[PDB]
């Protein structure tokens, strides 16, 4: 699972 694989904006 991981729907939040977004490690730049954030």
Partial sequence: ???GR???TI
């Fill in 6 to 8: 977004a490690f730049v």
């Fill in 1 to 3: 699972r991981g729907p």
